[PDB]
Amino acid sequence: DIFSRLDPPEAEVQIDRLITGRLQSLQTYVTQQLIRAAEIRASANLAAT
Amino acid sequence: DIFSRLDPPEAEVQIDRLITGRLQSLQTYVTQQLIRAAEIRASANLAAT
Protein backbone atom coordinates (compact mmCIF):
# COMPACT_ATOMS: atom_id res chain seq x y z
CA ASP A 1 0.00 0.00 0.00
CA ILE A 2 2.94 2.31 0.63
CA PHE A 3 4.00 2.19 -3.00
CA SER A 4 0.45 2.45 -4.31
CA ARG A 5 0.15 5.88 -2.69
CA LEU A 6 3.73 7.12 -2.48
CA ASP A 7 6.96 7.76 -4.38
CA PRO A 8 10.09 5.66 -3.89
CA PRO A 9 12.24 8.31 -2.15
CA GLU A 10 9.71 8.39 0.70
CA ALA A 11 8.57 4.77 0.45
CA GLU A 12 12.04 3.44 1.24
CA VAL A 13 11.90 5.31 4.56
CA GLN A 14 8.45 3.99 5.48
CA ILE A 15 9.31 0.41 4.59
CA ASP A 16 12.59 0.64 6.45
CA ARG A 17 10.68 1.56 9.62
CA LEU A 18 8.40 -1.45 9.31
CA ILE A 19 11.36 -3.73 8.59
CA THR A 20 13.15 -2.56 11.72
CA GLY A 21 10.04 -3.09 13.82
CA ARG A 22 9.35 -6.59 12.55
CA LEU A 23 13.02 -7.50 12.70
CA GLN A 24 12.94 -6.56 16.38
CA SER A 25 9.98 -8.93 16.74
CA LEU A 26 12.06 -11.82 15.46
CA GLN A 27 14.93 -11.00 17.79
CA THR A 28 12.57 -11.02 20.75
CA TYR A 29 11.06 -14.33 19.65
CA VAL A 30 14.36 -16.16 19.13
CA THR A 31 15.92 -14.87 22.36
CA GLN A 32 13.03 -16.19 24.40
CA GLN A 33 13.11 -19.59 22.69
CA LEU A 34 16.76 -20.00 23.66
CA ILE A 35 16.08 -19.05 27.28
CA ARG A 36 13.06 -21.34 27.45
CA ALA A 37 14.85 -24.21 25.71
CA ALA A 38 17.49 -24.18 28.45
CA GLU A 39 14.74 -24.79 31.02
CA ILE A 40 13.24 -27.79 29.21
CA ARG A 41 16.76 -29.10 28.69
CA ALA A 42 17.39 -28.91 32.44
CA SER A 43 14.13 -30.83 32.92
CA ALA A 44 15.11 -33.46 30.37
CA ASN A 45 18.40 -33.89 32.25
CA LEU A 46 16.52 -34.47 35.50
CA ALA A 47 14.16 -36.93 33.81
CA ALA A 48 17.09 -38.83 32.26
CA THR A 49 18.83 -38.96 35.64
CA ASP B 1 8.97 19.80 25.93
CA ILE B 2 9.17 18.49 22.37
CA PHE B 3 5.46 18.68 21.57
CA SER B 4 5.13 22.10 23.19
CA ARG B 5 7.85 23.89 21.22
CA LEU B 6 8.38 22.50 17.72
CA ASP B 7 5.60 21.34 15.39
CA PRO B 8 3.19 18.47 15.90
CA PRO B 9 4.17 16.54 12.73
CA GLU B 10 7.80 16.58 13.86
CA ALA B 11 7.06 16.09 17.54
CA GLU B 12 5.39 12.80 16.67
CA VAL B 13 8.50 11.44 14.95
CA GLN B 14 10.79 12.53 17.79
CA ILE B 15 8.45 11.16 20.45
CA ASP B 16 8.38 7.88 18.58
CA ARG B 17 12.19 7.85 18.80
CA LEU B 18 11.94 8.30 22.56
CA ILE B 19 9.32 5.56 22.76
CA THR B 20 11.48 3.18 20.75
CA GLY B 21 14.62 3.90 22.78
CA ARG B 22 12.86 3.58 26.11
CA LEU B 23 11.02 0.44 24.99
CA GLN B 24 14.33 -1.15 24.02
CA SER B 25 15.74 -0.31 27.45
CA LEU B 26 12.70 -1.84 29.15
CA GLN B 27 12.82 -4.94 26.97
CA THR B 28 16.50 -5.34 27.80
CA TYR B 29 15.57 -5.19 31.48
CA VAL B 30 13.03 -7.98 31.07
CA THR B 31 15.39 -10.24 29.10
CA GLN B 32 18.00 -9.98 31.80
CA GLN B 33 15.45 -10.79 34.49
CA LEU B 34 14.56 -14.02 32.74
CA ILE B 35 18.23 -14.93 32.45
CA ARG B 36 18.79 -14.17 36.14
CA ALA B 37 15.59 -15.91 37.20
CA ALA B 38 17.00 -19.18 35.83
CA GLU B 39 20.08 -18.81 38.00
CA ILE B 40 18.03 -18.30 41.14
CA ARG B 41 15.85 -21.30 40.26
CA ALA B 42 18.91 -23.47 39.64
CA SER B 43 20.22 -22.51 43.09
CA ALA B 44 16.85 -23.07 44.72
CA ASN B 45 16.63 -26.54 43.17
CA LEU B 46 20.03 -27.35 44.65
CA ALA B 47 18.99 -25.97 48.05
CA ALA B 48 15.83 -28.08 48.02
CA THR B 49 17.86 -31.16 47.13
Tab-separated table of C-alpha atoms in Angstrom:
chain	number	residue	atom	x	y	z
A	1	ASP	CA	0.000	0.000	0.000
A	2	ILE	CA	2.940	2.306	0.634
A	3	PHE	CA	3.997	2.191	-2.997
A	4	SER	CA	0.447	2.446	-4.314
A	5	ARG	CA	0.154	5.877	-2.687
A	6	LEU	CA	3.734	7.121	-2.481
A	7	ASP	CA	6.959	7.759	-4.383
A	8	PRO	CA	10.094	5.663	-3.892
A	9	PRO	CA	12.236	8.306	-2.147
A	10	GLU	CA	9.713	8.386	0.700
A	11	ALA	CA	8.567	4.770	0.445
A	12	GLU	CA	12.044	3.441	1.244
A	13	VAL	CA	11.903	5.306	4.561
A	14	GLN	CA	8.446	3.992	5.475
A	15	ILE	CA	9.307	0.411	4.587
A	16	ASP	CA	12.590	0.642	6.450
A	17	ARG	CA	10.684	1.562	9.625
A	18	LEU	CA	8.397	-1.452	9.312
A	19	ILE	CA	11.358	-3.733	8.587
A	20	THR	CA	13.146	-2.556	11.717
A	21	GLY	CA	10.038	-3.088	13.817
A	22	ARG	CA	9.353	-6.594	12.550
A	23	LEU	CA	13.025	-7.498	12.701
A	24	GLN	CA	12.944	-6.559	16.384
A	25	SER	CA	9.981	-8.928	16.736
A	26	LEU	CA	12.063	-11.824	15.459
A	27	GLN	CA	14.933	-11.003	17.792
A	28	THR	CA	12.571	-11.024	20.753
A	29	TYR	CA	11.062	-14.332	19.650
A	30	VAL	CA	14.355	-16.159	19.134
A	31	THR	CA	15.923	-14.869	22.357
A	32	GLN	CA	13.030	-16.194	24.395
A	33	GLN	CA	13.113	-19.587	22.687
A	34	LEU	CA	16.763	-19.996	23.660
A	35	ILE	CA	16.083	-19.045	27.277
A	36	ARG	CA	13.057	-21.344	27.451
A	37	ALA	CA	14.854	-24.213	25.714
A	38	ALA	CA	17.490	-24.184	28.453
A	39	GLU	CA	14.736	-24.794	31.016
A	40	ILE	CA	13.240	-27.792	29.207
A	41	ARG	CA	16.757	-29.096	28.693
A	42	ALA	CA	17.389	-28.912	32.436
A	43	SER	CA	14.134	-30.827	32.918
A	44	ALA	CA	15.107	-33.458	30.368
A	45	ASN	CA	18.402	-33.890	32.246
A	46	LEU	CA	16.517	-34.471	35.499
A	47	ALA	CA	14.164	-36.933	33.806
A	48	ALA	CA	17.086	-38.830	32.257
A	49	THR	CA	18.831	-38.957	35.645
B	1	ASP	CA	8.971	19.799	25.933
B	2	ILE	CA	9.169	18.486	22.369
B	3	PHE	CA	5.461	18.681	21.567
B	4	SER	CA	5.131	22.103	23.187
B	5	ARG	CA	7.853	23.893	21.224
B	6	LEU	CA	8.378	22.504	17.722
B	7	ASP	CA	5.604	21.344	15.389
B	8	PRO	CA	3.194	18.467	15.897
B	9	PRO	CA	4.172	16.541	12.726
B	10	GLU	CA	7.796	16.584	13.861
B	11	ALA	CA	7.062	16.094	17.540
B	12	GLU	CA	5.386	12.798	16.672
B	13	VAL	CA	8.499	11.436	14.946
B	14	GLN	CA	10.789	12.528	17.788
B	15	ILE	CA	8.445	11.164	20.452
B	16	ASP	CA	8.383	7.877	18.580
B	17	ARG	CA	12.188	7.848	18.801
B	18	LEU	CA	11.936	8.303	22.559
B	19	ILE	CA	9.321	5.563	22.763
B	20	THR	CA	11.477	3.176	20.753
B	21	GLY	CA	14.622	3.901	22.775
B	22	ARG	CA	12.858	3.582	26.110
B	23	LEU	CA	11.019	0.445	24.987
B	24	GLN	CA	14.326	-1.151	24.018
B	25	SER	CA	15.739	-0.314	27.445
B	26	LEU	CA	12.705	-1.843	29.148
B	27	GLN	CA	12.819	-4.944	26.967
B	28	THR	CA	16.496	-5.338	27.799
B	29	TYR	CA	15.567	-5.191	31.481
B	30	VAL	CA	13.025	-7.980	31.067
B	31	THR	CA	15.388	-10.241	29.103
B	32	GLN	CA	18.003	-9.983	31.801
B	33	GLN	CA	15.447	-10.786	34.494
B	34	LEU	CA	14.562	-14.022	32.736
B	35	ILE	CA	18.235	-14.928	32.446
B	36	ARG	CA	18.789	-14.167	36.144
B	37	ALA	CA	15.594	-15.913	37.205
B	38	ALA	CA	16.998	-19.178	35.833
B	39	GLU	CA	20.079	-18.809	38.002
B	40	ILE	CA	18.031	-18.302	41.141
B	41	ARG	CA	15.853	-21.301	40.256
B	42	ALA	CA	18.914	-23.469	39.638
B	43	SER	CA	20.224	-22.507	43.086
B	44	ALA	CA	16.845	-23.072	44.722
B	45	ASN	CA	16.633	-26.537	43.174
B	46	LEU	CA	20.028	-27.353	44.647
B	47	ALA	CA	18.994	-25.975	48.050
B	48	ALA	CA	15.827	-28.078	48.023
B	49	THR	CA	17.859	-31.164	47.127
